[PDB]
Design a protein around this nucleic acid. Structure first.
Ligand SMILES: Nc1nc2c(ncn2[C@@H]2O[C@H](COP(=O)(O)O[C@@H]3[C@H](O)[C@@H](COP(=O)(O)OP(=O)(O)OP(=O)(O)O)O[C@H]3n3cnc4c(=O)[nH]c(N)nc43)[C@@H](O)[C@H]2O)c(=O)[nH]1
Ligand SMILES: Nc1nc2c(ncn2[C@@H]2O[C@H](COP(=O)(O)O[C@@H]3[C@H](O)[C@@H](COP(=O)(O)OP(=O)(O)OP(=O)(O)O)O[C@H]3n3cnc4c(=O)[nH]c(N)nc43)[C@@H](O)[C@H]2O)c(=O)[nH]1
Ligand SMILES: [Mn+2]
Ligand SMILES: [Mn+2]
Ligand SMILES: [Mn+2]
Ligand SMILES: [Mn+2]
Ligand SMILES: [Zn+2]
Ligand SMILES: [Zn+2]
Lengths: 352, 341
DNA sequence: ATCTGTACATGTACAGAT
DNA sequence: ATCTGTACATGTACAGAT
DNA sequence: ATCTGTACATGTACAGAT
DNA sequence: ATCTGTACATGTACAGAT
């Protein structure tokens, strides 16, 4: 039923290995070049993030997310107009990206990008170009034409080892689920800043960064139970990741047909399900035999977020991803009707 | 009932503070002398172990265990007569690495430093053979002992005899196990019974387990449910201590026996709900039953070293074991009279 | 001669394949 | 049920540098 | 290399509520 | 009698500074 859908969504070991071998070649080579010279990004380290590395990538192994993180000691953060998620950075190889002590995201991203393009240019091993910059994106995106099309977001990131910013104090409400020790430990890991890089025309546009908890989200996905043995070989298997996939698929399929859904992304579904997992902590509430009622209750939750125009960042409570400012009421009522319809007619869109 | 017993066993915030301040003074000072002065034990680091640091110490804060661990480069181990737990070490004034030679110098230093402490009342206990410890007796108005335990630290994968040990897969899980087994392992100068023999120590791992003892991550946390696993451990420790005070026939038994047994019980009964505080009685009782079966069958395997039987004939006489069986059985079947002294 | 950043060596969880 | 490739963590060997 | 500052877990003690 | 909330105490990991 939904079992058969997940079978379709299941990646193939063969495709995984073909995609993985090529992607690793390129990434490895880019990462070397960032140190290989007296470059401003020497010391940058690699951290694989996103769905593929969380084992929730569906349909094909054709999008990979990688974080090129750089430790910046001695950092002063200033929150950008109470938004919660956006900051200026202040205070050395970075010398050339400063705006009198302020660190320009776009200056740094540009140099990062220029290097990447140069390195890609000198790869006649594999078929690979760099995608035209999209505004409001921190990524340098590689398009690889293995006989199959594969995208890789290379994401520049600052790494701070200090305590997380105050706006996250009330975030990550895992106490009743994964517990206090997991939370304290996670919050001792560093936090990450990535360029916002929009070209809206607003003040500080080019010097604004945004927080990233991709590393933490990865730990959670791969350690998702109240019982330590959830999904392990001497444990009981849950259906938490399976729900995540199914919901990801509903949004993808809808997004490929209807352009009224451009404002929506998978991060919305991931955020929503983090909330659901907090709300329903017990592994027994995600029993595989209850895949249907579980997926259904996730859908119901998501619709309520759309209806009430409210879906809080899981790490930054005050930052509403479903604000009027970010997504139109119309866009939200439109997605509400499409989800409601699919739900009440057997999920036609799963058969396409 | 047994709730009332635990109250008696509960340490007092005041005594904890007084004992802790004095113990830390001494340990801090010993640790400095090992490093800040040019000794063979130059890079030695501190790691607190045992009941007090596991929060299972009963009655009084009067015995403290501390490990002075030393990072020692790539070493070769060779198993001492198949026991599983005892090894010779190989590859500087202690050379094959003699446990006794090393322990002696370690001890000499400690004695010298203790000698020049006019701050606090503190002597060094007469050496007990087949003990890895230098034991300090501190006469705060209250008597307090501190085992300073020399330990070699190896970063290599654990020895082959432990491959089948630490059977936590159905309890704490495979990820916890793999991770724990990536931590280093420790060799302690316990003389085996000879003089160049070390013994493995998993005090660091036992500490993680005591403080992360549930199948649910929230066991005993502030947004979790409280279990009675540590309470059973205390109760069983107390039964053994009280019995040991009365009967010399029980000199061969120690709390490590009880701790080992309960590790097995926790493995056998993984679910936090099987250690519900409302079931303190049935839980303690089933622990007793398990321990008697170990005594009856003369078998209690080291939790980390399966082939090493702590209840072998070679280590404890049949008579000693039948004697403890009768005493435990009696206490059990008459409401634990011994808990009222 | 010693030291070291880099690459290899070892081990295992996760999940896909048989 | 067993087997197998990938990703990821930690230990160690070593050519090139000091 | 060593030390201090910070944050929070695991305790204990006790009052007021259930 | 037990539970819940607060205060008070110790232990411990790690970052940033010296
Ligand atoms: N892969 C992917 N790309 C999408 C999706 N919807 C739109 N896009 C593309 O994103 C570009 C513009 O950026 P955006 O802000 O609209 O989209 C981001 C981000 O790209 C998307 C999720 O992408 P991901 O990080 O690769 O996701 P993951 O690996 O978890 O799953 P999968 O890739 O399999 O879907 O979500 C948006 N987003 C918004 N806020 C955040 C945030 O804080 N973190 C992250 N990680 N993403 C965020 C355009 O090219 C557009 O086409 C989509 O569903 N998937
Ligand atoms: N504290 C204590 N001392 C005891 C006990 N029974 C006997 N002793 C004294 O130890 C001397 C040496 O004999 P032993 O080798 O049989 O004793 C050891 C060890 O002393 C004892 C447990 O001591 P601990 O490590 O301080 O205990 P823990 O901190 O877990 O709890 P607590 O101190 O609250 O009881 O058990 C014996 N033992 C045997 N194998 C091991 C092992 O692998 N590890 C450890 N740690 N101990 C082991 C005798 O002369 C006597 O005076 C006793 O119950 N407690
Ligand atoms: Mn992705
Ligand atoms: Mn992406
Ligand atoms: Mn002890
Ligand atoms: Mn001791
Ligand atoms: Zn699971
Ligand atoms: Zn517990």
């Amino acid at each position: 039923k939904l079992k058969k859908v997940l079978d379709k969504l299941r990646l193939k070991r063969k495709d995984i290995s073909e995609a993985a071998e090529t992607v690793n070649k390129v990434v490895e080579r880019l990462l070397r070049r960032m140190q290989k010279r007296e470059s401003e990004f020497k010391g940058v380290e690699q951290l694989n993030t996103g769905s593929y590395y969380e084992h929730v990538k569906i349909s094909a192994p054709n999008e990979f997310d990688v974080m090129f993180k750089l430790e910046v000691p001695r950092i002063e953060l200033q929150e950008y107009y109470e938004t919660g998620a956006f900051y200026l950075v202040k205070f050395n190889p970075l010398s050339h990206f400063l705006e009198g002590e302020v660190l320009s995201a776009t200056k740094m991203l540009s140099k990062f990008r220029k290097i990447i393009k140069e390195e890609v240019k000198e790869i006649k091993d594999i078929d690979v170009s760099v995608e035209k910059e999209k505004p409001g994106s921190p990524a340098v995106t590689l398009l690889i034409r293995n006989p199959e099309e594969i995208s890789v977001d290379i994401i520049l990131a600052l790494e701070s080892k200090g305590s997380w910013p105050i706006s996250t104090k009330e975030g990550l409400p895992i106490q009743g689920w994964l517990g206090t020790k997991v939370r304290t430990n996670l919050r001792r890991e560093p936090f990450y800043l990535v360029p916002k890089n929009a070209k809206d025309g607003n003040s500080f546009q080019g010097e604004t960064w945004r927080l990233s908890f991709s590393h933490t989200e990865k730990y959670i996905l791969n350690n998702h139970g109240i019982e330590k043995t959830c999904c392990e070989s001497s444990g009981a298997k849950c259906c938490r990741k399976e729900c995540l996939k199914l919901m990801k698929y509903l949004l993808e399929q809808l997004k490929k047909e209807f352009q009224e859904l451009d404002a929506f992304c998978s991060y919305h579904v991931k955020t929503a399900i983090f909330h659901m997992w907090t709300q329903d902590p017990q592994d027994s509430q995600w029993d595989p035999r209850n895949l249907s009622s579980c997926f259904d209750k996730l859908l119901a939750f998501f619709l309520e977020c759309l209806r009430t125009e409210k879906l809080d960042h899981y790490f930054i409570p005050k930052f509403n991803l479903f604000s009027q400012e970010l997504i139109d009421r119309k866009s939200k009522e439109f997605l509400s009707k499409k989800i409601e319809y699919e739900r009440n007619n057997g999920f036609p869109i799963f058969d396409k």
